[PDB]
Design a protein around this ligand. Structure first.
Ligand SMILES: *[C@@H]1O[C@H](CO)[C@@H](O[C@@H]2O[C@H](CO)[C@@H](O[C@@H]3O[C@H](CO)[C@@H](O)[C@H](O)[C@@H]3O)[C@H](O)[C@H]2NC(C)=O)[C@H](O)[C@H]1NC(C)=O
Ligand SMILES: *[C@@H]1O[C@H](CO)[C@@H](O[C@@H]2O[C@H](CO)[C@@H](O[C@@H]3O[C@H](CO)[C@@H](O)[C@H](O)[C@@H]3O)[C@H](O)[C@H]2NC(C)=O)[C@H](O)[C@H]1NC(C)=O
Ligand SMILES: *[C@@H]1O[C@H](CO)[C@@H](O[C@@H]2O[C@H](CO)[C@@H](O[C@@H]3O[C@H](CO)[C@@H](O)[C@H](O)[C@@H]3O)[C@H](O)[C@H]2NC(C)=O)[C@H](O)[C@H]1NC(C)=O
Ligand SMILES: *[C@@H]1O[C@H](CO)[C@@H](O[C@@H]2O[C@H](CO)[C@@H](O)[C@H](O)[C@H]2NC(C)=O)[C@H](O)[C@H]1NC(C)=O
Ligand SMILES: *[C@@H]1O[C@H](CO)[C@@H](O[C@@H]2O[C@H](CO)[C@@H](O)[C@H](O)[C@H]2NC(C)=O)[C@H](O)[C@H]1NC(C)=O
Ligand SMILES: *[C@@H]1O[C@H](CO)[C@@H](O[C@@H]2O[C@H](CO)[C@@H](O)[C@H](O)[C@H]2NC(C)=O)[C@H](O)[C@H]1NC(C)=O
Ligand SMILES: *[C@@H]1O[C@H](CO)[C@@H](O)[C@H](O)[C@H]1NC(C)=O
Lengths: 614, 124
């Protein structure tokens, strides 16, 4: 299990910019512009444009509030008039340079519209968002705009009994089948297009009730799925339906410890400036006995692609003679491959679209959407497993250290408004710091990263507002030792400026900078006076930031024992000399000790010169 | 149904089962004719709807009379009373598909021990 966050930053001790509109709640949708300087917020009954560099600067505002006759219609359907019967923005996507595509629950009448960016006024397109947007603010939902066409995963109805992964195309509308083999009680988590003869694919991530597994209760299972951008459906069968829909198990577990995380919470696509293949960073929690635990598994796209392209499918079979069981299909697979895209191979066999695929192949995919092979993580284990924390959303920044060693920086939000910064150091997790983003411990519902030159920020939304944080707080570190010991690839010590700087931001010289991810503060170069009355009591204040260090006191060059009657420890860090007399005068030193590898790192926290009067 | 025009009573021939759902053949199997007045049919379906809509399929006093069939991710509800009159044929917000726990019971009018009934026509 991952250790405790090395340093805890109170909302008070760091520079965090906040945004909220009075009487406006549920800041669940976040979208930043092309230029990255304008962040758009989708809340309950409102859409805003804020300066992404200072979220507190409100630029534009637009509302989409529900009428009383629509609220009462919703309430008459036994829903909560002042809770669920309101317009929760669920779809906030780029449409053009001059517009956004917006959908809201709208007292259970999913409605879509175009937000005119030049005016920040809605165009009144008033489209029926049934299938595109959920009815209930409680229902799961995911959407990705690909080539001005919305690819959405949510419920097709009011009750949330009909799930749907569909494309609102207008030219070629396509949707999933309303069948258990296709989708079995899913809870949508994330979707994105993975761009390139070879066609683009639109991946979907969700948790659904498993068909392959049987246990005491119904077992959930994380799913990775994909569809082909060029899909047009089948001609005779799969009319207006996906022909390219294949899914597989997403497995996040440490078995030598019986830890299985079968509930997917978030998915982030690490788009490597260097690496040609994207890495999905997926966030999971266990369905069973969650108390709570969180795990972060990283999946190489190539792995998943290997399953969808060459993996054996699963067959459903009748078993004695009213039951259905699912097993590996070892029978003959049709050609062209069921679920495959219109690639170079297909085009050679005179196949231009799904509309001209053989009925043999189309029937196969319709009856075999599920793959036998699981999609496994890189190094076949989670990147991080944490206890006593319920992680909510994830973002990852691939950063180059001073050394040139590349670290994948994990920003993980909690259900209590906190953000953890973690890196997988040499075969062990290091949680650099934790920051309390929300003073009200509101769970971070959404998280969004901008790693772009200048505007390097993380944006977190909750029901109470939005928070803007940098990727590091290098300046909070006082000494070179403190700067190095942090083991943050973002932070380096600058001897000329006598400040711990943010490497890859500051205008300090690279060649003349200090950073050691080993934590060996050895690479570094290197008195509060008091006058108290006789008989009186002294409180010598001492504090440090490491949650992984312990402090001890020293008087007259010896390790002082804070025991009654002469001594006491107030708050485990502040020394208390009780009965002051001639001999108590002199130097009192507060020291810290923290283990890095095998070695211990002692640091002098406080220096005190106590003088007792006569 | 009774015809001379179209009655209000459903006459249904039933046969006892053999060990796909074949009726036990020859003298080992028997048949019966049961009458289920369609108002009795509607009374029960209406009370199955009413329970499932307003009182969680429980129906006072006691209880567990309606549920959602075919494993559909729906449940019975505690909807306003007005739902019954407002939505007789249901809506996007009402539980579906509903089914009764309580069966519609009929005692035979005909009980033939060695015969396997295949067709019914009734007149008056
Ligand atoms: C994600 O999965 C892909 C799929 O294989 C990984 O890519 C491949 O990794 C192998 C392993 O070495 C590469 O093979 C060889 O690399 C050595 C190293 O220099 C080279 O000397 C050999 O001649 C050969 O090239 C293979 O080329 C490479 N292919 C691609 C497209 O990347 C990828 O590394 C995985 N990424 C992660 C983070 O797991
Ligand atoms: C949108 O944001 C608002 C802002 O907090 C969320 O409001 C909160 O709603 C919950 C209920 O869902 C309130 O909890 C209470 O639950 C008990 C249990 O029965 C009930 O008896 C109480 O009357 C109350 O509803 C919570 O107090 C309330 N917060 C505030 C400040 O009023 C809202 O739930 C969010 N909606 C979504 C879809 O996230
Ligand atoms: C089952 O419940 C349904 C309602 O959900 C009952 O239907 C309602 O039944 C009444 C009883 O007759 C109907 O009223 C009558 O309509 C006729 C038609 O013109 C009229 O001539 C009579 O004077 C009277 O107004 C009512 O229209 C009907 N509503 C609907 C939507 O069907 C049904 O009778 C119940 N069946 C049983 C066995 O309980
Ligand atoms: C989007 O909003 C802009 C903002 O007004 C609209 O611009 C006006 O467009 C008309 C022509 O249609 C011009 O005559 C006005 O002078 C424009 N005013 C401004 C301030 O630019 C634009 O038309 C809107 N687009 C749509 C589709 O409604
Ligand atoms: C969602 O589907 C609707 C259904 O057609 C699309 O509506 C058409 O939109 C185009 C402009 O993009 C208009 O020229 C057509 O006249 C519209 N037809 C109808 C029937 O609405 C809509 O554009 C789709 N939206 C997205 C984001 O894909
Ligand atoms: C982690 O999240 C779980 C829920 O997923 C929390 O468990 C709930 O805690 C509340 C607080 O009293 C209880 O009323 C609920 O009954 C609990 N539900 C379950 C399923 O246990 C858990 O406390 C959270 N723990 C941490 C460390 O975040
Ligand atoms: C932007 O941030 C600065 C930093 O303190 C603050 O002084 C200024 O008022 C903020 N702008 C707005 C509109 O809040």
């Amino acid at each position: 299990f991952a250790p405790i966050p090395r340093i805890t930053w109170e909302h008070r001790e760091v520079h965090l910019v906040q945004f909220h509109e009075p009487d406006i709640y549920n800041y669940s949708a976040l979208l930043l512009s092309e230029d990255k300087d304008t962040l758009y917020i989708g809340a309950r009954e409102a859409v805003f444009a804020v300066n992404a560099l200072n979220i507190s600067e409100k630029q534009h505002e637009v509302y989409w509030k529900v009428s009383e006759d629509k609220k009462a219609k919703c309430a008459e359907k036994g829903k909560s008039k002042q809770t669920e019967c309101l317009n929760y923005i669920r779809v906030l996507q780029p449409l053009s340079a001059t517009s956004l595509y917006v959908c809201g629950t709208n007292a259970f009448q999913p409605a879509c519209d175009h937000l005119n960016l030049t005016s920040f006024k809605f165009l009144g397109k008033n489209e029926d968002g049934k299938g595109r947007c959920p009815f209930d603010p409680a229902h799961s939902y995911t959407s990705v705009m690909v080539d001005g066409e919305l690819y959405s995963g949510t419920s097709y109805n009011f009750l949330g009994s009909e799930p749907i992964i569909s494309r609102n195309s207008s030219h070629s509308p396509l949707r999933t089948e309303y069948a258990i083999p296709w989708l079995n009680e899913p809870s949508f988590v994330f979707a994105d297009v993975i761009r390139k003869g070879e066609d683009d694919r639109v991946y979907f991530f969700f948790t659904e009730v498993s068909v392959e597994y049987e246990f005491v209760f119904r077992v959930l299972i994380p799913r990775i799925a994909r569809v082909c951008k060029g899909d047009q459906g089948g001609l005779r069968t799969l009319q207006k339906k996906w022909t390219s829909f294949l899914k597989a198990r997403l497995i996040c577990s440490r078995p030598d410890s019986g830890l299985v995380f079968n509930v997917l919470r978030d998915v982030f696509v690490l788009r490597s400036p260097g690496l040609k293949v994207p890495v999905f960073y997926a966030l999971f929690t266990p369905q069973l006995n969650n108390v709570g635990l969180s795990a972060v598994c990283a999946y190489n796209l190539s792995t998943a692609e290997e399953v969808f392209s060459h993996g054996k499918y699963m067959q459903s079979t009748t078993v004695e003679q009213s039951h259905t069981k699912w097993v590996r299909y070892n029978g003959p697979v049709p050609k062209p491959r069921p679920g495959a895209c219109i690639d170079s191979e297909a085009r050679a066999a005179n196949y231009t679209s799904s509309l001209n695929l053989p009925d043999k192949t189309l029937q196969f995919v319709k009856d075999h959407p599920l793959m036998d092979d699981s999609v496994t993580p890189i190094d076949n284990r989670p990147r991080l497993i944490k206890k006593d924390v319920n992680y909510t959303q994830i973002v990852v920044d691939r950063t180059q250290a001073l050394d040139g060693t590349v670290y994948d920086v994990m920003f993980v939000s909690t259900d209590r408004g906190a953000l953890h910064k973690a890196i997988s150091l040499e075969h062990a997790v290091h949680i650099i710091e934790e920051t309390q983003l929300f003073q009200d411990f509101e769970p971070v519902q959404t998280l969004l990263l901008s790693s772009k030159k200048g505007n390097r920020f993380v944006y977190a939304g909750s029901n109470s507002g939005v928070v803007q944080a940098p990727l590091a707080f290098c300046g909070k570190h006082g000494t070179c030792e403190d700067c190095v010991l942090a083991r943050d690839p973002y932070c380096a010590w600058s001897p000329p400026t006598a400040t711990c700087v943010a490497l890859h931001q500051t205008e300090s010289p690279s060649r003349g900078l200090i950073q050691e991810m080993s934590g060996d503060a050895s690479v570094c170069p290197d008195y509060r006076q008091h006058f108290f009355k006789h008989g009186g009591t002294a409180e010598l204040k001492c504090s440090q930031k490491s949650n992984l260090a312990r402090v001890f006191w020293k008087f007259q060059n010896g390790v002082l024992k804070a025991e009654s009657p002469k001594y006491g420890l107030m708050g485990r860090k502040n020394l208390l000399i009780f009965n002051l007399s001639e001999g108590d005068s002199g130097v009192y030193q507060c020291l810290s000790e923290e283990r890095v590898k095998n070695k211990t790192v002692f640091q002098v926290v406080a220096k005190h010169v106590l003088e007792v009067k006569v | 149904v009774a015809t001379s025009a179209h009655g209000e009573v459903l006459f249904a021939a039933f046969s006892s089962a053999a060990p796909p759902p074949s009726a036990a053949a020859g003298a080992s199997g028997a048949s019966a004719l049961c009458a289920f007045p369609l108002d009795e049919v509607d009374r029960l379906a209406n009370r199955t709807r009413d329970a499932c809509y307003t009182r969680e399929g429980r129906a006072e006093d006691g209880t567990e009379v309606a549920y959602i069939e075919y494993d559909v991710n729906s449940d019975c509800a505690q909807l306003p009373v007005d739902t019954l009159d407002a939505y007789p044929c249901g809506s996007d917000h009402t539980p579906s598909p509903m089914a009764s726990r309580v069966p519609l019971e009929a005692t035979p009018i005909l009980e033939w021990p060695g015969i396997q009934l295949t067709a019914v026509a009734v007149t008056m």
